[PDB]
Write a protein that binds this ligand. Structure first.
Ligand SMILES: *[C@@H]1O[C@H](CO[C@@H]2O[C@@H](C)[C@@H](O)[C@@H](O)[C@@H]2O)[C@@H](O[C@@H]2O[C@H](CO)[C@@H](O[C@@H]3O[C@H](CO[C@H]4O[C@H](CO)[C@@H](O)[C@H](O[C@H]5O[C@H](CO)[C@@H](O)[C@H](O)[C@@H]5O)[C@@H]4O)[C@@H](O)[C@H](O[C@H]4O[C@H](CO)[C@@H](O)[C@H](O)[C@@H]4O)[C@@H]3O)[C@H](O)[C@H]2NC(C)=O)[C@H](O)[C@H]1NC(C)=O
Ligand SMILES: *[C@@H]1O[C@H](CO[C@@H]2O[C@@H](C)[C@@H](O)[C@@H](O)[C@@H]2O)[C@@H](O[C@@H]2O[C@H](CO)[C@@H](O)[C@H](O)[C@H]2NC(C)=O)[C@H](O)[C@H]1NC(C)=O
Ligand SMILES: [Cl-]
Ligand SMILES: [Cl-]
Ligand SMILES: [Cl-]
Lengths: 139, 126
């Protein structure tokens, strides 16, 4: 096929000389086979804190500093967490609007379940923190 | 999955107290919230008190605010209703009720709800 195609993970295609598959520099990785150059590891700095170490074979995986939660794919960015019974607004955490609720550190206030719409009485009213608990069918 | 047994019914003069017990059995982790319902002959089923097993919040009916107390004990896997200052109107069949989810949701392998057999509570004098 190509010379450079059983090149294992942790290595790249080299020309200058007698190495086909030379290993990756430090702070670089290639999980592929035959790569042309090794990718430079992700740095987890500031808001982010390194969860997994960087390796020749696999990239470093970013965690997200306590107070924040991981967001998007691969922890692309880091969003501030509120307590339950709040959602994060433009200005910062705010209490849920009356008749909405949120039971998580992250996320948006959702509205209470309407029990009548599903044909049940209410067993327990909701709070900012907690949903409604529908009871049985009436009558 | 869940069985509920009532205890502690009986007859009492007005103003005396009584304490209902509802013992849960089997898949008790399924239970989220519980309550007491009552049914008088002629009138409709009335919710009396409810409770969140987790956090322990209670809802009472106006007609018993102040007089009744609903409580829970996870160790004994039981729910209590303390009924003080009983009135003639309190006379009804008390059913114990249990739910397995929030809103109208229920836990995958279990029942949306469960009931007990009911106990009879009578308040007339002499
Ligand atoms: C859960 O949602 C419930 C249901 O929501 C609604 O219906 C279902 C089918 C869904 O499609 C939803 O999308 C929809 O919004 C909700 O209960 C509803 O609440 C609204 C008000 O919030 C009710 O409408 C009100 O009616 C008042 C009293 O009028 C009564 O008596 C009249 C006597 O003739 C009669 O005309 C009227 O008939 C209408 O209601 C019946 C149900 O009984 C309905 O089926 C029928 O189609 C008729 O349209 C009714 O019985 C009005 O006075 C009041 O309007 C006044 O206030 C407004 C304030 O802005 C003024 O602008 C306005 O001009 C009036 O002065 C009000 O609009 C609605 O009918 C009711 N639906 C049902 C089926 O009961 C429930 O509250 C939710 N639960 C929680 C936890 O939020
Ligand atoms: C449990 O919920 C109902 C709903 O009441 C409304 O929403 C509540 C969260 C709160 O905003 C109430 O003040 C609202 O009225 C309660 O039933 C109400 O009871 C009152 C007093 O008799 C009556 O006048 C209201 O109209 C009722 N509302 C409706 C639509 O039926 C119930 O008592 C609540 N119990 C609690 C929080 O302990
Ligand atoms: Cl830093
Ligand atoms: Cl996270
Ligand atoms: Cl006991």
């Amino acid at each position: 096929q190509d010379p450079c195609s059983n090149c294992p993970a942790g290595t790249f295609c080299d020309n200058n000389r007698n190495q086909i598959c030379s290993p990756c520099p430090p702070n670089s990785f290639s999980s592929a086979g035959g790569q042309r150059t090794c990718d430079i590891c992700r740095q987890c700095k500031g808001v982010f804190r390194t969860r997994k170490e960087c390796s020749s074979t696999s990239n470093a995986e970013c965690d997200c500093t306590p107070g924040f939660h991981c967001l998007g794919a691969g922890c692309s960015m880091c969003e501030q967490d509120c307590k339950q019974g709040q959602e994060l607004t433009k200005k910062g955490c705010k209490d849920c609007c009356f008749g909405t609720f949120n039971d998580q550190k992250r996320g948006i206030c959702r509205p209470w379940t309407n029990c009548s719409l599903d044909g049940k009485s209410v067993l327990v009213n909701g709070t900012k923190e907690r949903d409604v608990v529908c009871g049985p069918s009436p009558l | 999955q869940v069985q509920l047994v009532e205890s502690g019914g009986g007859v009492v003069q007005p103003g005396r107290s009584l304490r209902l017990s509802c013992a849960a059995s089997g898949s008790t982790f399924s239970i989220v919230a519980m309550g007491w319902y009552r049914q008088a002959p002629g009138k409709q089923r009335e919710l009396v008190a409810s409770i969140i097993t987790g956090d322990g919040d209670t809802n009472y009916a106006d007609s018993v605010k102040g007089r009744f107390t609903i409580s829970r004990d996870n160790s004994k896997n039981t729910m209590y209703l303390q009924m003080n200052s009983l009135k003639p109107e309190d006379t009804a069949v008390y059913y114990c009720y249990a739910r397995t989810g929030y809103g109208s949701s229920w836990l995958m392998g279990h029942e949306y709800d469960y009931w007990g057999q009911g106990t009879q509570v009578t308040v007339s004098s002499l």
